[PDB]
Structure 1
Amino acid sequence: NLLEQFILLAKGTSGSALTALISQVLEAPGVYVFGELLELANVQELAEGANAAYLQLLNLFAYGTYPDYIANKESLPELSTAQQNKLKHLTIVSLASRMKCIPYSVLLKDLEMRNLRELEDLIIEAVYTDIIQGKLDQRNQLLEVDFCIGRDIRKKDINNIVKTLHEWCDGCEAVLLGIEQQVLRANQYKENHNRTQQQVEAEVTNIKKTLKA
């Protein structure tokens, strides 16, 4: 409910106050999705002006990952304490979206960490926020993800949703057709076998009858 509270608080604010509200939104805990804030006209109006840095920061927090704050570090404003942790959590979510068994090396590289203890503590505190759910295997150095939240989307990604839902629908339809075909074939086999058995019995009975001569 936090994001709609901030949006209502930002109905008319613009300029410096809007940038301050953007920073407070990025720092506020529990807000891991910023898509309704981005749809606001005044928020998108920051491109024309000297505040395009905050719009870039919001875009990075909505669709980007932590390594992207490795090449735009100079242009972007300074990042706070909790903001970096939130970006790292969103990077973990982005990694878990693709693969369900994230190796430790990948997390260490993209999250820019040096120790295993620090990485495991970050993953544990990300789990405690209920953005991802999973278990840590240390003998094999894997993070096994059972559930993760859906991050923000652009207008050019919905086509992918349609593409991957069409495959599922077609697979279900093809499974149903195969099931019906198997049922039909089995019924035909049973009927043919009992017709053949009854015909053999009828032939034997006829032979027995004509044998009485």
Structure 2
Amino acid sequence: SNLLEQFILLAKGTSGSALTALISQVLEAPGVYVFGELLELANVQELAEGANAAYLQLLNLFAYGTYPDYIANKESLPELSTAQQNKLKHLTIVSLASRMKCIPYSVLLKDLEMRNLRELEDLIIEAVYTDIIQGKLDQRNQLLEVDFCIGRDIRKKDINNIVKTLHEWCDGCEAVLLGIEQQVLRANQYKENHNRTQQQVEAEVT
């Protein structure tokens, strides 16, 4: 929470060179990967898409892009730290995990351009360790079981998809639940006729 204002004043105070610092801070700020509303400051708007537009480019990468993008584009973006680079790696991993309930190991092994299990699991556990991810790695499946994912970024203007989306999930529950509901309803209706006939006989007895 602290960093948003922290960067806010930074963008206000800091540009270009000062920016190189802020950007250095922003890169290093977990959760503060994407600017969204944060970019709304004109100062950062200039700072973004600036000479170091590439910085903004990595910003977008945090929003949309991936670590494999860096794999292709080692040069394109501004340079990063091992910490930061593995950060972007985790970024792609979390993203993929969003796509697949359990991302296979080789998926990121190729995606991140990772060699093997030691580092692979180390970073994966680190990612989960941040508590962003839940579950555990799927050893049988060579995947990663996860209960939930902690919010890292905005990821740029997604509003269309996300907004579109809430009802869909709702629809799934609505449809199946309804089916059981109506079956119950019809059953209750039978109850009515059954009780109804029972009452009719009651009337008869008098």
Alpha carbons of 1:125 and 1:146: their partners in 2 closer, same or farther (altered >3 Å)? same
Instruction: Kindly state the Cα deviation for residue 51 of structure 1 after the two structures are TM-superposed.
Output: 2.4
Instruction: Kindly state the Cα deviation for residue 83 of structure 1 after the two structures are TM-superposed.
Output: 1.1
8 Å contact kept, 1:10–1:21: yes
Alpha carbons of 1:176 and 1:130: their partners in 2 closer, same or farther (altered >3 Å)? closer
Give distance in 2, aligned partners of 1:33 and 1:146: 24
Aligned to 2:71: 70
The structure, 1 or 2, with the larger RCO (C-alpha pairs under 8 Å, 6+ apart) is 2
> Residue deviations 1:104-147, cap 9 Å, x none?
11020011111211101111111221222231233432211111
Which ranges in structure 2 are unaligned for 5 or more consecutive residues?
Answer: none
Residue 88 of structure 2 aligns to a residue whose secondary structure is: helix
Give distance in 1, aligned partners of 2:155 and 2:31: 21
* Number of aligned residues: 205
> Residue deviations 1:42-74, cap 9 Å, x none?
222246652222221222233321011123222
> Residue deviations 1:70-125, cap 9 Å, x none?
23222222222221121112112111111111111102001111121110111111
Give distance in 2, aligned partners of 1:87 and 1:170: 34
Higher strand share goes to which structure? 1
Alpha carbons of 1:34 and 1:54: their partners in 2 closer, same or farther (altered >3 Å)? same
TM-score by length of 2: 0.81
8 Å contact kept, 1:101–1:143: yes
Give distance in 2, aligned partners of 1:84 and 1:120: 16
> Residue deviations 1:191-213, cap 9 Å, x none?
32344456668879xxxxxxxx9
Which ranges in structure 1 are unaligned for 5 or more consecutive residues?
Answer: 205-212
8 Å contact kept, 1:131–1:149: yes
Alpha carbons of 1:168 and 1:95: their partners in 2 closer, same or farther (altered >3 Å)? closer
Residue 35 of structure 2 aligns to a residue whose secondary structure is: coil
The worse-fitting range, judged by mean Cα deviation, of 47-56 and 139-148 is 47-56
Larger radius of gyration: 1
Alpha carbons of 1:182 and 1:18: their partners in 2 closer, same or farther (altered >3 Å)? same
RMSD across aligned C-alpha pairs, in angstroms? Answer: 3.3
8 Å contact kept, 1:30–1:129: no
Give distance in 2, aligned partners of 1:32 and 1:87: 9
Residue 115 of structure 2 aligns to a residue whose secondary structure is: coil
8 Å contact kept, 2:55–2:78: yes
Give distance in 2, aligned partners of 1:154 and 1:125: 21
The worse-fitting range, judged by mean Cα deviation, of 92-101 and 162-171 is 162-171
Residue 93 of structure 2 aligns to a residue whose secondary structure is: helix
Aligned-pair identity (%): 100
8 Å contact kept, 1:56–1:76: yes
Give distance in 2, aligned partners of 1:198 and 1:58: 73
Give distance in 1, aligned partners of 2:35 and 2:122: 25
8 Å contact kept, 2:34–2:59: no
